[PDB]
Amino acid sequence: TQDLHIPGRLDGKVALVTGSGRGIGAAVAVHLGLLGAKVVVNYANSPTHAQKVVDEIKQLGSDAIAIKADVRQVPEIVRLFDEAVAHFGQLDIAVSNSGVVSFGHLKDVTEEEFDRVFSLNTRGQFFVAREAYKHLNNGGRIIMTSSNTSRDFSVPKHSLYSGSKGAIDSFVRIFSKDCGDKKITVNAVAPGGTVTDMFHDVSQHYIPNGETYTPEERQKMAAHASPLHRNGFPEDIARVVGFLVSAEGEWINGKVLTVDGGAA
Amino acid sequence: HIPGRLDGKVALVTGSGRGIGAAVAVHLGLLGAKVVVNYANSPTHAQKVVDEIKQLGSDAIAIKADVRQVPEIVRLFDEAVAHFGQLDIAVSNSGVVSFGHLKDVTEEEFDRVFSLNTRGQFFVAREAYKHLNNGGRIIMTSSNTSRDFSVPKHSLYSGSKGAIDSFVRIFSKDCGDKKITVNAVAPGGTVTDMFHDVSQHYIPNGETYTPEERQKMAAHASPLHRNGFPEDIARVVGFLVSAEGEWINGKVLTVDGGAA
Amino acid sequence: LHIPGRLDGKVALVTGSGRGIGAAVAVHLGLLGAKVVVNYANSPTHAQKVVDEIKQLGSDAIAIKADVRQVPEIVRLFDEAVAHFGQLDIAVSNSGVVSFGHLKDVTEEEFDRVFSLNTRGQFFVAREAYKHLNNGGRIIMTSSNTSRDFSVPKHSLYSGSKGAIDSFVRIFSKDCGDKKITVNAVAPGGTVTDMFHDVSQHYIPNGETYTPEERQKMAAHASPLHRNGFPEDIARVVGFLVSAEGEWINGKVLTVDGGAA
Amino acid sequence: HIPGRLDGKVALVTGSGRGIGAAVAVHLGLLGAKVVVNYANSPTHAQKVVDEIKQLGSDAIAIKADVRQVPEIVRLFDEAVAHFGQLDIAVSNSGVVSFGHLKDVTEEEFDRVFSLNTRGQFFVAREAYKHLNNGGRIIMTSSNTSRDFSVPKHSLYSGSKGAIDSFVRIFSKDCGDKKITVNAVAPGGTVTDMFHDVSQHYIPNGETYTPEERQKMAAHASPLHRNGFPEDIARVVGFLVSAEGEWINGKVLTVDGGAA
């Protein structure tokens, strides 16, 4: 009785999160800090935001650094991971989060748009996993980021993006087998509509007559997707990531968790 | 509010005198919940789980109820709420395993399995919905045999759990009117007396090996080269029934260490 | 000139083939050359119309009354089928009932009404099919796009009754391989039948506020092909699965809903 | 109209000089389609397929196009329509396999696989949609490794095909504006040079055994105790691309004989 159980702590662990200056990655980075991890905050374009995330993690009593790395470029992924281990001594947790959204009828999709989406969402994530396996401590954690659009929800004009995430679901199942030789688990989270810069950029494409409504209105209509009648927020996703990368999440391995509040 | 804790909440777990249910009950108590430990046949083991939850500093009571009988399910939930004043979390765990070729399955055997595994769980969820506080949690128990793994001579049991996977998806819609989340956990091979009872039927030529050899060979199913244990399942249930698990709703989480 | 997918010299049994999807399946298998056992429990005149259409097409059929909630009636149905045609190659488990209600309102009686036919009934139709079929035969079971693909409010009991079927067919394919029998399910979307008309109000948002005909027209927009599902759509897939050419689809649930959203 | 026939239709199959593509091409011709036989490397095999289809009484032409190159996909579809006047059915079949632990996968190997299996298939679907008559058919080619079977060291290929499963579901929505259905076939182990190239990677100590011995062992994956053959896949494609297949739309059909 002299012990109150504190579940899911990451004290003594080092995490890296791709694209953690903003949106879901930021909330993952802060949540892992809150749980006791030291955090490598990665950005490509948003150093102002990355600084605020670093400051937020230091403020709640952990440590953090920001490292610029364009995760479309494999040489920059190698450097990101090399710099992470040089700075903190080790790496236990890698969360592949960076991504871009796209909308377009099949007939209008160009080579350039296909390559813009796959280079980050699919190829970038793959090589983030590759470098994570190669740098992680035994018993570590790899997380990849999919979407409820890969399998559960079928949105018109969303083929390119949906396919970029469907690849991820397949990678994590096989990666769990390969990464077993270091006792590293590999899982994905597949968020539903989560209120971020990305959400506001494209919510008109998910709502039936979306272009005809205001952003605030589209957010309210998205809140009725869930039988809980609220939006998904970045912290909702971060909480699941925190469970999977904890010691206690070990027996969830090679799985894609859909985190959408039960959306219809 | 410590993240992941259940302080001030009340939980009920069917079949928590032993196996996975016992691990779930102790874990929810460890997280700060008061626990109703249901048993049908194992009163002594149930009291030991109660005494363990009290020793780690929470409260618990054992209530006898055969969850094949819907009137006993109603009475179990009525007595839970009467004792602790409220219920926030209901975990439907009780189940039985069965093996046999389609051609050999009797009406008696179909009824034995579906009455507990499927009908029983359905009416546990029904009484949970009716008794639970707003913002509460329902967990049902499936199996990685429902969808992920196709074992010969396992059709009755696999189908009994496949029904659960469908129930949770729709239950999340119905139960949203009380902001209750509904999920299932689908364990893989988890070391309990159920596991040891049928490990021969899951290992190729399993009758040919010893019980310890069957457990070692199951260990290699996971890329992590260990068996699943009741605690592994309990930890996932604990997360789902916490405030922090709210955005997992209407899902089946397969908890098998990445088994092949 | 190659004629694919024929069933000449084969014998098929379809449960609940007097009306709706079952009737379309029975007529389709007859058109492809199978002799057909038309099962009914309550609709003898409907069943005789189906037998008459199959004979008109150039095949042979009989109607056999059997309530497939009752395992003894299932045993008799299969014994009578083999006694009459000499053999059985194809068993299609189709009989079902729909149900709607919030979890909180579902009674023991309604749970038992639905599972006894939809789940237990189908299970024992498969059992007696395995025991009576020729080597190299076919079992088809009927699921629903509501088991996994769509999640409809107040539809838990029915959706679960069909999710059990999906698990059964996967494991049945293993057990039934020792007679080279393949086992699959079809999972229809909204298919225009008596059942469809009975419950379309519960699938369409504020369905009670529209006519049965209006509800049908609204369901036609679920598919990107902008038409309803019909019994024939489902019969066509069952016909491919029970053909020689369908052999390499085994242990699968095929969702047949025209791509519905 | 004869049930299941394609009289008066024109089909195009990528990679139809050999393997599964060749069986698809001959099967669509046997059913009454005129067939465009695409190859990139196998002109003499493509001509043998063309001569087979002419011999059974249909018409065919072989067209060289590397479907890694989107401008060559455009030209393939342009030349198909210019030759037969129309296109009704497009089967995206070309693919390559890859094995390697995640730690060993290069940029060059990722691009080799995704450029053909994922990007190439996507742009074949794009050009099919732009060239097809209303009421047409697109088929893409996945694998049972994308979802059903998790083979070690198979991540790059499995992911290449997992993208396909997502493409077909959304393509079915976009292509509905021309009443074109879009489906994938996901073969299991199917006896071709691809099968033989990696059957050692799907068997423990596989590198020991002979190729014929590995094929005999694979035949026991199915409860039907035979291998899958290209014809097994071609018959499913023939059904999906027929008038009678219309109500299967946006789906991935796993065609593996019930493999475990």
Ligand SMILES: NC(=O)c1ccc[n+]([C@@H]2O[C@H](COP(=O)([O-])OP(=O)(O)OC[C@H]3O[C@@H](n4cnc5c(N)ncnc54)[C@H](OP(=O)(O)O)[C@@H]3O)[C@@H](O)[C@H]2O)c1
């Ligand atoms: N929001 C949703 O509803 C939703 C739903 C399902 C899935 N997702 C997925 O969840 C993940 C995050 O989404 P979000 O909503 O947070 O997106 P967001 O708000 O758009 O943020 C995108 C993040 O990705 C980073 N990023 C972009 N390009 C990068 C590059 N080349 N290299 C490294 N990092 C890069 C950005 O960093 P910089 O600003 O520094 O470039 C930014 O941190 C994505 O993978 C997305 O596909 C989101």
Ligand SMILES: NC(=O)c1ccc[n+]([C@@H]2O[C@H](COP(=O)([O-])OP(=O)(O)OC[C@H]3O[C@@H](n4cnc5c(N)ncnc54)[C@H](OP(=O)(O)O)[C@@H]3O)[C@@H](O)[C@H]2O)c1
């Ligand atoms: N172990 C595995 O590998 C595995 C894998 C997948 C799924 N599961 C599932 O996980 C759940 C628990 O399995 P387990 O391994 O812990 O099995 P177990 O050790 O056999 O325990 C069975 C539990 O069910 C209870 N129970 C049995 N009949 C009951 C009744 N009529 N009313 C109320 N409770 C009843 C038992 O209580 P009494 O002794 O008091 O009867 C006992 O607590 C089951 O639903 C099982 O199907 C287990």
Ligand SMILES: NC(=O)c1ccc[n+]([C@@H]2O[C@H](COP(=O)([O-])OP(=O)(O)OC[C@H]3O[C@@H](n4cnc5c(N)ncnc54)[C@H](OP(=O)(O)O)[C@@H]3O)[C@@H](O)[C@H]2O)c1
């Ligand atoms: N229509 C849809 O949208 C849809 C969608 C998905 C799945 N399904 C499923 O497809 C199957 C056929 O549905 P439907 O639309 O054709 O339904 P229906 O129009 O309601 O016809 C029901 C059939 O089931 C027979 N039946 C009922 N009780 C029976 C019993 N005790 N024993 C034997 N047969 C019995 C009926 O024969 P009697 O009249 O002789 O009793 C009748 O032929 C069902 O399993 C249904 O769940 C339908």
Ligand SMILES: NC(=O)c1ccc[n+]([C@@H]2O[C@H](COP(=O)([O-])OP(=O)(O)OC[C@H]3O[C@@H](n4cnc5c(N)ncnc54)[C@H](OP(=O)(O)O)[C@@H]3O)[C@@H](O)[C@H]2O)c1
């Ligand atoms: N067990 C299996 O066989 C199996 C299982 C699951 C899925 N699959 C899939 O089924 C499909 C066919 O496989 P298969 O077994 O028949 O393989 P295969 O025997 O190796 O045949 C490969 C085919 O792809 C064509 N191809 C290769 N590169 C090409 C390019 N750049 N442009 C156009 N075409 C090209 C080849 O033509 P050229 O010789 O002219 O280059 C050949 O026709 C593939 O998508 C594969 O992933 C196969």
Ligand SMILES: Cc1cc(O)c2c(c1)C(=O)c1cc(O)cc(O)c1C2=O
């Ligand atoms: C109801 C709804 C509204 C949205 O704005 C999104 C989504 C859902 C959604 O599922 C989604 C998934 C995704 O991978 C990226 C997104 O930007 C999204 C969204 O933006």
Ligand SMILES: Cc1cc(O)c2c(c1)C(=O)c1cc(O)cc(O)c1C2=O
């Ligand atoms: C490799 C292995 C060995 C086993 O004994 C089991 C399993 C797997 C398994 O998946 C399983 C599922 C289940 O629902 C009940 C069980 O008793 C089990 C098992 O017993």
Ligand SMILES: Cc1cc(O)c2c(c1)C(=O)c1cc(O)cc(O)c1C2=O
């Ligand atoms: C849009 C829509 C309208 C309907 O009437 C049904 C359905 C869908 C549907 O999916 C369905 C499934 C089923 O198993 C039985 C039904 O009666 C149905 C339906 O009746």
Ligand SMILES: Cc1cc(O)c2c(c1)C(=O)c1cc(O)cc(O)c1C2=O
């Ligand atoms: C039992 C078995 C043996 C094999 O050789 C293969 C497979 C299965 C298999 O599934 C497979 C899938 C695939 O997409 C490509 C392949 O070359 C294959 C295979 O080669």
